[PDB]
Amino acid sequence: MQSINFRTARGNLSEVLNNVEAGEEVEITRRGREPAVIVSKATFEEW
Amino acid sequence: MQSINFRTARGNLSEVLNNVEAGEEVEITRRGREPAVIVSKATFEEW
Numbered sequence: 905m906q907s908i909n910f911r912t913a914r915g916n917l918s919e920v921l922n923n924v925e926a927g928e929e930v931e932i933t934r935r936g937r938e939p940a941v942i943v944s945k946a947t948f949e950e951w
Numbered sequence: 952m953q954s955i956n957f958r959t960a961r962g963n964l965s966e967v968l969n970n971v972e973a974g975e976e977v978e979i980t981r982r983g984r985e986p987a988v989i990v991s992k993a994t995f996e997e998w
Contacts, residue, residue: 910964910965913964914961914964917957917961921979921981924987925984925987929995931992932989937968938991940972940990940991940992941989941991941994941995942987942989943987944987945986945987945988946985948976948988948990951998
């Protein structure tokens with residue numbers, strides 16, 4: 905479980921999605937807001 | 952589960968993340984590549 909901020913997710917989305925594809929789960933933080941979690945379609949369907 | 956292409960998601964990540972927090976599970980697609988699914992941290996913890 906890696907964590908990145910919104911500006912890192914936005915400016916580096918292509919690489920972020922490459923990390924996710926491999927198996928990594930990426931949490932996207934935002935000041936005063938609930939974090940979002942990006943997971944692969946395979947991880948999604950397993951659970 | 953909603954679905955948006957990479958190009959749209961990159962440009963509109965803020966709206967995507969607000970929709971994810973509002974209760975949607977969003978699939979980001981890229982041609983020839985595995986789709987990524989964005990869930991809220993609450994949905995992720997519930998797994």
